[PDB]
PDB file of all heavy atoms in Angstrom:
ATOM      1  N   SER V 158      91.069 119.142  22.302  1.00 21.50           N
ATOM      2  CA  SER V 158      91.027 117.692  22.424  1.00 21.50           C
ATOM      3  C   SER V 158      90.455 117.055  21.165  1.00 21.50           C
ATOM      4  O   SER V 158      90.981 116.047  20.675  1.00 21.50           O
ATOM      5  CB  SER V 158      90.220 117.294  23.654  1.00 21.50           C
ATOM      6  OG  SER V 158      88.995 117.993  23.700  1.00 21.50           O
ATOM      7  N   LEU V 159      89.389 117.635  20.614  1.00 18.03           N
ATOM      8  CA  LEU V 159      88.823 117.093  19.383  1.00 18.03           C
ATOM      9  C   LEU V 159      89.802 117.222  18.225  1.00 18.03           C
ATOM     10  O   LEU V 159      89.929 116.309  17.400  1.00 18.03           O
ATOM     11  CB  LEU V 159      87.504 117.781  19.059  1.00 18.03           C
ATOM     12  CG  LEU V 159      86.230 117.129  19.578  1.00 18.03           C
ATOM     13  CD1 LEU V 159      85.108 118.132  19.592  1.00 18.03           C
ATOM     14  CD2 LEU V 159      85.864 115.971  18.699  1.00 18.03           C
ATOM     15  N   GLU V 160      90.514 118.346  18.153  1.00 18.15           N
ATOM     16  CA  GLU V 160      91.514 118.536  17.113  1.00 18.15           C
ATOM     17  C   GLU V 160      92.593 117.473  17.191  1.00 18.15           C
ATOM     18  O   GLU V 160      92.922 116.827  16.184  1.00 18.15           O
ATOM     19  CB  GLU V 160      92.128 119.926  17.244  1.00 18.15           C
ATOM     20  CG  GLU V 160      93.297 120.178  16.336  1.00 18.15           C
ATOM     21  CD  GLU V 160      93.900 121.545  16.547  1.00 18.15           C
ATOM     22  OE1 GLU V 160      93.881 122.023  17.699  1.00 18.15           O
ATOM     23  OE2 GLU V 160      94.391 122.141  15.567  1.00 18.15           O
ATOM     24  N   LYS V 161      93.166 117.289  18.380  1.00 20.03           N
ATOM     25  CA  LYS V 161      94.188 116.272  18.566  1.00 20.03           C
ATOM     26  C   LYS V 161      93.668 114.900  18.170  1.00 20.03           C
ATOM     27  O   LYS V 161      94.340 114.156  17.448  1.00 20.03           O
ATOM     28  CB  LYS V 161      94.658 116.269  20.014  1.00 20.03           C
ATOM     29  CG  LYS V 161      96.006 115.641  20.225  1.00 20.03           C
ATOM     30  CD  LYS V 161      96.145 115.117  21.629  1.00 20.03           C
ATOM     31  CE  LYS V 161      97.258 114.103  21.724  1.00 20.03           C
ATOM     32  NZ  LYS V 161      97.151 113.289  22.961  1.00 20.03           N
ATOM     33  N   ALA V 162      92.464 114.554  18.625  1.00 19.06           N
ATOM     34  CA  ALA V 162      91.908 113.246  18.313  1.00 19.06           C
ATOM     35  C   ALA V 162      91.798 113.033  16.812  1.00 19.06           C
ATOM     36  O   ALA V 162      92.278 112.022  16.288  1.00 19.06           O
ATOM     37  CB  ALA V 162      90.545 113.085  18.974  1.00 19.06           C
ATOM     38  N   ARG V 163      91.193 113.983  16.101  1.00 18.51           N
ATOM     39  CA  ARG V 163      90.953 113.798  14.672  1.00 18.51           C
ATOM     40  C   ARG V 163      92.259 113.700  13.892  1.00 18.51           C
ATOM     41  O   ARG V 163      92.429 112.812  13.039  1.00 18.51           O
ATOM     42  CB  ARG V 163      90.089 114.939  14.147  1.00 18.51           C
ATOM     43  CG  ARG V 163      88.762 115.062  14.855  1.00 18.51           C
ATOM     44  CD  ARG V 163      87.871 116.074  14.199  1.00 18.51           C
ATOM     45  NE  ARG V 163      86.845 115.429  13.396  1.00 18.51           N
ATOM     46  CZ  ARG V 163      85.552 115.450  13.685  1.00 18.51           C
ATOM     47  NH1 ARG V 163      85.126 116.087  14.760  1.00 18.51           N
ATOM     48  NH2 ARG V 163      84.687 114.836  12.899  1.00 18.51           N
ATOM     49  N   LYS V 164      93.200 114.599  14.176  1.00 20.13           N
ATOM     50  CA  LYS V 164      94.444 114.599  13.419  1.00 20.13           C
ATOM     51  C   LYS V 164      95.259 113.344  13.694  1.00 20.13           C
ATOM     52  O   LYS V 164      95.767 112.705  12.758  1.00 20.13           O
ATOM     53  CB  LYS V 164      95.235 115.859  13.742  1.00 20.13           C
ATOM     54  CG  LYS V 164      94.483 117.117  13.392  1.00 20.13           C
ATOM     55  CD  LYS V 164      95.337 118.341  13.558  1.00 20.13           C
ATOM     56  CE  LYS V 164      94.670 119.545  12.949  1.00 20.13           C
ATOM     57  NZ  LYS V 164      95.451 120.771  13.196  1.00 20.13           N
ATOM     58  N   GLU V 165      95.387 112.960  14.966  1.00 19.56           N
ATOM     59  CA  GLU V 165      96.119 111.745  15.285  1.00 19.56           C
ATOM     60  C   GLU V 165      95.443 110.531  14.672  1.00 19.56           C
ATOM     61  O   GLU V 165      96.110 109.582  14.251  1.00 19.56           O
ATOM     62  CB  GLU V 165      96.250 111.600  16.799  1.00 19.56           C
ATOM     63  CG  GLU V 165      96.833 110.284  17.255  1.00 19.56           C
ATOM     64  CD  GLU V 165      96.864 110.157  18.764  1.00 19.56           C
ATOM     65  OE1 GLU V 165      96.621 111.171  19.453  1.00 19.56           O
ATOM     66  OE2 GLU V 165      97.134 109.044  19.263  1.00 19.56           O
ATOM     67  N   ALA V 166      94.112 110.554  14.583  1.00 22.47           N
ATOM     68  CA  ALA V 166      93.397 109.438  13.983  1.00 22.47           C
ATOM     69  C   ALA V 166      93.759 109.269  12.521  1.00 22.47           C
ATOM     70  O   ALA V 166      94.070 108.157  12.074  1.00 22.47           O
ATOM     71  CB  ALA V 166      91.891 109.640  14.132  1.00 22.47           C
ATOM     72  N   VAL V 167      93.724 110.356  11.756  1.00 21.24           N
ATOM     73  CA  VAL V 167      94.021 110.241  10.329  1.00 21.24           C
ATOM     74  C   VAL V 167      95.473 109.827  10.119  1.00 21.24           C
ATOM     75  O   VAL V 167      95.787 109.011   9.244  1.00 21.24           O
ATOM     76  CB  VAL V 167      93.693 111.551   9.597  1.00 21.24           C
ATOM     77  CG1 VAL V 167      94.137 111.466   8.168  1.00 21.24           C
ATOM     78  CG2 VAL V 167      92.215 111.807   9.661  1.00 21.24           C
ATOM     79  N   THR V 168      96.380 110.371  10.932  1.00 22.37           N
ATOM     80  CA  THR V 168      97.781 109.994  10.787  1.00 22.37           C
ATOM     81  C   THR V 168      97.995 108.517  11.089  1.00 22.37           C
ATOM     82  O   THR V 168      98.711 107.818  10.353  1.00 22.37           O
ATOM     83  CB  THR V 168      98.656 110.857  11.687  1.00 22.37           C
ATOM     84  OG1 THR V 168      98.557 112.222  11.275  1.00 22.37           O
ATOM     85  CG2 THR V 168     100.098 110.423  11.591  1.00 22.37           C
ATOM     86  N   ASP V 169      97.387 108.020  12.167  1.00 22.80           N
ATOM     87  CA  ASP V 169      97.519 106.609  12.502  1.00 22.80           C
ATOM     88  C   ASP V 169      96.944 105.728  11.411  1.00 22.80           C
ATOM     89  O   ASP V 169      97.524 104.688  11.081  1.00 22.80           O
ATOM     90  CB  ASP V 169      96.833 106.320  13.831  1.00 22.80           C
ATOM     91  CG  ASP V 169      97.381 105.092  14.516  1.00 22.80           C
ATOM     92  OD1 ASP V 169      98.137 104.335  13.871  1.00 22.80           O
ATOM     93  OD2 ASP V 169      97.060 104.880  15.703  1.00 22.80           O
ATOM     94  N   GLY V 170      95.808 106.124  10.842  1.00 22.14           N
ATOM     95  CA  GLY V 170      95.232 105.340   9.766  1.00 22.14           C
ATOM     96  C   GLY V 170      96.138 105.273   8.555  1.00 22.14           C
ATOM     97  O   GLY V 170      96.301 104.215   7.944  1.00 22.14           O
ATOM     98  N   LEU V 171      96.743 106.404   8.192  1.00 22.39           N
ATOM     99  CA  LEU V 171      97.643 106.418   7.045  1.00 22.39           C
ATOM    100  C   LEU V 171      98.855 105.532   7.287  1.00 22.39           C
ATOM    101  O   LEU V 171      99.263 104.771   6.401  1.00 22.39           O
ATOM    102  CB  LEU V 171      98.071 107.848   6.737  1.00 22.39           C
ATOM    103  CG  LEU V 171      98.906 108.078   5.483  1.00 22.39           C
ATOM    104  CD1 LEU V 171      98.128 107.704   4.249  1.00 22.39           C
ATOM    105  CD2 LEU V 171      99.336 109.516   5.423  1.00 22.39           C
ATOM    106  N   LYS V 172      99.439 105.604   8.482  1.00 17.29           N
ATOM    107  CA  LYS V 172     100.591 104.759   8.776  1.00 17.29           C
ATOM    108  C   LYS V 172     100.217 103.284   8.727  1.00 17.29           C
ATOM    109  O   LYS V 172     100.937 102.466   8.138  1.00 17.29           O
ATOM    110  CB  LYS V 172     101.172 105.118  10.141  1.00 17.29           C
ATOM    111  CG  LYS V 172     101.974 106.391  10.151  1.00 17.29           C
ATOM    112  CD  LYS V 172     102.722 106.558  11.452  1.00 17.29           C
ATOM    113  CE  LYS V 172     101.774 106.665  12.617  1.00 17.29           C
ATOM    114  NZ  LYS V 172     102.500 106.831  13.895  1.00 17.29           N
ATOM    115  N   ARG V 173      99.082 102.927   9.326  1.00 18.87           N
ATOM    116  CA  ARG V 173      98.671 101.531   9.337  1.00 18.87           C
ATOM    117  C   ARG V 173      98.333 101.037   7.942  1.00 18.87           C
ATOM    118  O   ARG V 173      98.553  99.862   7.634  1.00 18.87           O
ATOM    119  CB  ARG V 173      97.489 101.340  10.283  1.00 18.87           C
ATOM    120  CG  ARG V 173      97.884 101.303  11.747  1.00 18.87           C
ATOM    121  CD  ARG V 173      96.702 101.083  12.660  1.00 18.87           C
ATOM    122  NE  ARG V 173      95.801 100.055  12.169  1.00 18.87           N
ATOM    123  CZ  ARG V 173      95.822  98.792  12.573  1.00 18.87           C
ATOM    124  NH1 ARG V 173      96.703  98.401  13.475  1.00 18.87           N
ATOM    125  NH2 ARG V 173      94.961  97.920  12.073  1.00 18.87           N
ATOM    126  N   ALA V 174      97.828 101.913   7.076  1.00 18.73           N
ATOM    127  CA  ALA V 174      97.508 101.498   5.715  1.00 18.73           C
ATOM    128  C   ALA V 174      98.767 101.333   4.882  1.00 18.73           C
ATOM    129  O   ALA V 174      98.834 100.465   4.007  1.00 18.73           O
ATOM    130  CB  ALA V 174      96.565 102.510   5.070  1.00 18.73           C
ATOM    131  N   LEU V 175      99.775 102.165   5.129  1.00 18.24           N
ATOM    132  CA  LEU V 175     101.021 102.025   4.391  1.00 18.24           C
ATOM    133  C   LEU V 175     101.848 100.851   4.884  1.00 18.24           C
ATOM    134  O   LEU V 175     102.721 100.380   4.148  1.00 18.24           O
ATOM    135  CB  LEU V 175     101.832 103.317   4.471  1.00 18.24           C
ATOM    136  CG  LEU V 175     101.347 104.449   3.568  1.00 18.24           C
ATOM    137  CD1 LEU V 175     101.933 105.758   3.998  1.00 18.24           C
ATOM    138  CD2 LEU V 175     101.698 104.181   2.130  1.00 18.24           C
ATOM    139  N   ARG V 176     101.610 100.377   6.109  1.00 19.03           N
ATOM    140  CA  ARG V 176     102.279  99.161   6.567  1.00 19.03           C
ATOM    141  C   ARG V 176     102.063  97.999   5.612  1.00 19.03           C
ATOM    142  O   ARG V 176     102.973  97.192   5.401  1.00 19.03           O
ATOM    143  CB  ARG V 176     101.775  98.752   7.945  1.00 19.03           C
ATOM    144  CG  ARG V 176     102.306  99.540   9.106  1.00 19.03           C
ATOM    145  CD  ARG V 176     101.608  99.082  10.366  1.00 19.03           C
ATOM    146  NE  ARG V 176     101.991  99.853  11.539  1.00 19.03           N
ATOM    147  CZ  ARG V 176     101.336  99.815  12.690  1.00 19.03           C
ATOM    148  NH1 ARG V 176     100.266  99.044  12.814  1.00 19.03           N
ATOM    149  NH2 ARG V 176     101.742 100.547  13.716  1.00 19.03           N
ATOM    150  N   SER V 177     100.870  97.896   5.027  1.00 16.77           N
ATOM    151  CA  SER V 177     100.493  96.696   4.291  1.00 16.77           C
ATOM    152  C   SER V 177     101.194  96.571   2.950  1.00 16.77           C
ATOM    153  O   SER V 177     100.898  95.638   2.199  1.00 16.77           O
ATOM    154  CB  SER V 177      98.984  96.669   4.082  1.00 16.77           C
ATOM    155  OG  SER V 177      98.301  96.869   5.305  1.00 16.77           O
ATOM    156  N   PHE V 178     102.103  97.477   2.617  1.00 14.61           N
ATOM    157  CA  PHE V 178     102.839  97.354   1.371  1.00 14.61           C
ATOM    158  C   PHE V 178     104.181  96.681   1.557  1.00 14.61           C
ATOM    159  O   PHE V 178     104.756  96.192   0.581  1.00 14.61           O
ATOM    160  CB  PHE V 178     103.053  98.724   0.731  1.00 14.61           C
ATOM    161  CG  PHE V 178     101.857  99.247   0.014  1.00 14.61           C
ATOM    162  CD1 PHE V 178     101.064 100.210   0.589  1.00 14.61           C
ATOM    163  CD2 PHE V 178     101.528  98.786  -1.236  1.00 14.61           C
ATOM    164  CE1 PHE V 178      99.967 100.692  -0.065  1.00 14.61           C
ATOM    165  CE2 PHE V 178     100.429  99.270  -1.892  1.00 14.61           C
ATOM    166  CZ  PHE V 178      99.650 100.222  -1.302  1.00 14.61           C
ATOM    167  N   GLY V 179     104.699  96.649   2.772  1.00 15.05           N
ATOM    168  CA  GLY V 179     105.966  95.991   2.996  1.00 15.05           C
ATOM    169  C   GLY V 179     106.642  96.515   4.238  1.00 15.05           C
ATOM    170  O   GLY V 179     106.137  97.396   4.935  1.00 15.05           O
ATOM    171  N   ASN V 180     107.815  95.944   4.498  1.00 13.65           N
ATOM    172  CA  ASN V 180     108.572  96.295   5.690  1.00 13.65           C
ATOM    173  C   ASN V 180     109.128  97.709   5.601  1.00 13.65           C
ATOM    174  O   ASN V 180     109.311  98.377   6.624  1.00 13.65           O
ATOM    175  CB  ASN V 180     109.704  95.294   5.888  1.00 13.65           C
ATOM    176  CG  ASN V 180     109.209  93.935   6.290  1.00 13.65           C
ATOM    177  OD1 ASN V 180     108.184  93.808   6.949  1.00 13.65           O
ATOM    178  ND2 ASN V 180     109.935  92.904   5.894  1.00 13.65           N
ATOM    179  N   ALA V 181     109.403  98.181   4.392  1.00 12.68           N
ATOM    180  CA  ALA V 181     110.068  99.461   4.205  1.00 12.68           C
ATOM    181  C   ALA V 181     109.146 100.629   4.510  1.00 12.68           C
ATOM    182  O   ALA V 181     109.558 101.787   4.413  1.00 12.68           O
ATOM    183  CB  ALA V 181     110.605  99.581   2.781  1.00 12.68           C
ATOM    184  N   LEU V 182     107.901 100.344   4.869  1.00 11.65           N
ATOM    185  CA  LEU V 182     106.930 101.389   5.149  1.00 11.65           C
ATOM    186  C   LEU V 182     106.307 101.263   6.530  1.00 11.65           C
ATOM    187  O   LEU V 182     105.282 101.899   6.796  1.00 11.65           O
ATOM    188  CB  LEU V 182     105.845 101.393   4.076  1.00 11.65           C
ATOM    189  CG  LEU V 182     106.301 101.942   2.730  1.00 11.65           C
ATOM    190  CD1 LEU V 182     105.183 101.855   1.723  1.00 11.65           C
ATOM    191  CD2 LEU V 182     106.773 103.366   2.872  1.00 11.65           C
ATOM    192  N   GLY V 183     106.888 100.468   7.412  1.00 14.09           N
ATOM    193  CA  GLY V 183     106.433 100.365   8.774  1.00 14.09           C
ATOM    194  C   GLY V 183     105.898  99.022   9.212  1.00 14.09           C
ATOM    195  O   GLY V 183     105.296  98.945  10.289  1.00 14.09           O
ATOM    196  N   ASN V 184     106.089  97.968   8.429  1.00 13.98           N
ATOM    197  CA  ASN V 184     105.685  96.634   8.840  1.00 13.98           C
ATOM    198  C   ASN V 184     106.721  95.954   9.720  1.00 13.98           C
ATOM    199  O   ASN V 184     106.494  94.824  10.161  1.00 13.98           O
ATOM    200  CB  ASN V 184     105.410  95.764   7.614  1.00 13.98           C
ATOM    201  CG  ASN V 184     104.365  94.709   7.873  1.00 13.98           C
ATOM    202  OD1 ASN V 184     103.529  94.853   8.760  1.00 13.98           O
ATOM    203  ND2 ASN V 184     104.402  93.639   7.095  1.00 13.98           N
ATOM    204  N   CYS V 185     107.849  96.610   9.978  1.00  9.14           N
ATOM    205  CA  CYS V 185     108.873  96.080  10.862  1.00  9.14           C
ATOM    206  C   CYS V 185     108.575  96.326  12.328  1.00  9.14           C
ATOM    207  O   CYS V 185     108.936  95.492  13.164  1.00  9.14           O
ATOM    208  CB  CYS V 185     110.227  96.701  10.530  1.00  9.14           C
ATOM    209  SG  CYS V 185     110.878  96.271   8.921  1.00  9.14           S
ATOM    210  N   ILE V 186     107.929  97.443  12.662  1.00  6.87           N
ATOM    211  CA  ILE V 186     107.746  97.827  14.054  1.00  6.87           C
ATOM    212  C   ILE V 186     106.841  96.883  14.823  1.00  6.87           C
ATOM    213  O   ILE V 186     106.657  97.065  16.029  1.00  6.87           O
ATOM    214  CB  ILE V 186     107.202  99.266  14.137  1.00  6.87           C
ATOM    215  CG1 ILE V 186     105.802  99.343  13.534  1.00  6.87           C
ATOM    216  CG2 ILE V 186     108.134 100.220  13.433  1.00  6.87           C
ATOM    217  CD1 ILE V 186     104.988 100.501  14.060  1.00  6.87           C
ATOM    218  N   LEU V 187     106.268  95.883  14.161  1.00  6.95           N
ATOM    219  CA  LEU V 187     105.451  94.883  14.828  1.00  6.95           C
ATOM    220  C   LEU V 187     106.205  93.593  15.115  1.00  6.95           C
ATOM    221  O   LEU V 187     105.738  92.791  15.929  1.00  6.95           O
ATOM    222  CB  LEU V 187     104.213  94.573  13.985  1.00  6.95           C
ATOM    223  CG  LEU V 187     103.382  95.788  13.584  1.00  6.95           C
ATOM    224  CD1 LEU V 187     102.317  95.388  12.586  1.00  6.95           C
ATOM    225  CD2 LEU V 187     102.760  96.415  14.811  1.00  6.95           C
ATOM    226  N   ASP V 188     107.349  93.375  14.477  1.00  8.05           N
ATOM    227  CA  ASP V 188     108.140  92.169  14.670  1.00  8.05           C
ATOM    228  C   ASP V 188     108.987  92.355  15.921  1.00  8.05           C
ATOM    229  O   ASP V 188     109.841  93.244  15.969  1.00  8.05           O
ATOM    230  CB  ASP V 188     109.014  91.913  13.441  1.00  8.05           C
ATOM    231  CG  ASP V 188     109.855  90.653  13.554  1.00  8.05           C
ATOM    232  OD1 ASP V 188     109.915  90.041  14.640  1.00  8.05           O
ATOM    233  OD2 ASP V 188     110.466  90.268  12.536  1.00  8.05           O
ATOM    234  N   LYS V 189     108.755  91.516  16.930  1.00  6.55           N
ATOM    235  CA  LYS V 189     109.454  91.692  18.196  1.00  6.55           C
ATOM    236  C   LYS V 189     110.914  91.271  18.084  1.00  6.55           C
ATOM    237  O   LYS V 189     111.772  91.758  18.829  1.00  6.55           O
ATOM    238  CB  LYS V 189     108.735  90.923  19.298  1.00  6.55           C
ATOM    239  CG  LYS V 189     107.360  91.484  19.605  1.00  6.55           C
ATOM    240  CD  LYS V 189     106.696  90.758  20.756  1.00  6.55           C
ATOM    241  CE  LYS V 189     106.252  89.362  20.349  1.00  6.55           C
ATOM    242  NZ  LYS V 189     105.157  89.396  19.339  1.00  6.55           N
ATOM    243  N   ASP V 190     111.219  90.381  17.140  1.00  6.58           N
ATOM    244  CA  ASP V 190     112.609  90.017  16.892  1.00  6.58           C
ATOM    245  C   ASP V 190     113.406  91.216  16.405  1.00  6.58           C
ATOM    246  O   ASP V 190     114.507  91.489  16.897  1.00  6.58           O
ATOM    247  CB  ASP V 190     112.672  88.884  15.868  1.00  6.58           C
ATOM    248  CG  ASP V 190     112.514  87.518  16.498  1.00  6.58           C
ATOM    249  OD1 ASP V 190     112.942  87.341  17.655  1.00  6.58           O
ATOM    250  OD2 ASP V 190     111.954  86.618  15.834  1.00  6.58           O
ATOM    251  N   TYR V 191     112.852  91.950  15.443  1.00  5.34           N
ATOM    252  CA  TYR V 191     113.509  93.140  14.916  1.00  5.34           C
ATOM    253  C   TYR V 191     113.606  94.231  15.976  1.00  5.34           C
ATOM    254  O   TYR V 191     114.585  94.983  16.022  1.00  5.34           O
ATOM    255  CB  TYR V 191     112.745  93.614  13.681  1.00  5.34           C
ATOM    256  CG  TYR V 191     112.980  95.031  13.246  1.00  5.34           C
ATOM    257  CD1 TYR V 191     114.009  95.348  12.381  1.00  5.34           C
ATOM    258  CD2 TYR V 191     112.137  96.045  13.660  1.00  5.34           C
ATOM    259  CE1 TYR V 191     114.209  96.638  11.970  1.00  5.34           C
ATOM    260  CE2 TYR V 191     112.327  97.333  13.256  1.00  5.34           C
ATOM    261  CZ  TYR V 191     113.363  97.629  12.410  1.00  5.34           C
ATOM    262  OH  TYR V 191     113.551  98.931  12.008  1.00  5.34           O
ATOM    263  N   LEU V 192     112.617  94.312  16.865  1.00  2.11           N
ATOM    264  CA  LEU V 192     112.678  95.293  17.943  1.00  2.11           C
ATOM    265  C   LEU V 192     113.801  94.967  18.917  1.00  2.11           C
ATOM    266  O   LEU V 192     114.564  95.852  19.327  1.00  2.11           O
ATOM    267  CB  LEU V 192     111.342  95.363  18.674  1.00  2.11           C
ATOM    268  CG  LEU V 192     110.159  95.950  17.910  1.00  2.11           C
ATOM    269  CD1 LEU V 192     109.034  96.266  18.869  1.00  2.11           C
ATOM    270  CD2 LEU V 192     110.571  97.186  17.144  1.00  2.11           C
ATOM    271  N   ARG V 193     113.907  93.698  19.317  1.00  2.00           N
ATOM    272  CA  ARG V 193     115.022  93.280  20.156  1.00  2.00           C
ATOM    273  C   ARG V 193     116.353  93.558  19.479  1.00  2.00           C
ATOM    274  O   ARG V 193     117.292  94.045  20.116  1.00  2.00           O
ATOM    275  CB  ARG V 193     114.910  91.796  20.488  1.00  2.00           C
ATOM    276  CG  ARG V 193     113.885  91.443  21.546  1.00  2.00           C
ATOM    277  CD  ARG V 193     114.049  89.995  21.988  1.00  2.00           C
ATOM    278  NE  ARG V 193     113.830  89.054  20.893  1.00  2.00           N
ATOM    279  CZ  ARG V 193     114.803  88.477  20.195  1.00  2.00           C
ATOM    280  NH1 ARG V 193     116.069  88.745  20.471  1.00  2.00           N
ATOM    281  NH2 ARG V 193     114.511  87.634  19.216  1.00  2.00           N
TER     282      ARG V 193
END
């Protein structure tokens, strides 16, 4: 459980940090229009 928590945490942080560079890196998945 600790392993899963730590690894998923670092991965989520990296994805969220790369979002802030533009849509081509994951800033689209928050726009509900694009999801629809």
Side-chain angles (χ1 to χ4, degrees):
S158 48
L159 267 161
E160 173 182 33
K161 201 205 161 197
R163 302 187 103 112
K164 300 187 169 176
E165 172 183 349
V167 174
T168 297
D169 204 348
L171 186 63
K172 284 190 298 180
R173 282 181 44 97
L175 283 164
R176 283 175 184 167
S177 309
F178 281 102
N180 290 329
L182 287 178
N184 210 24
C185 294
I186 65 156
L187 307 171
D188 181 351
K189 294 183 288 293
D190 275 328
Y191 161 88
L192 291 194
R193 283 191 298 99

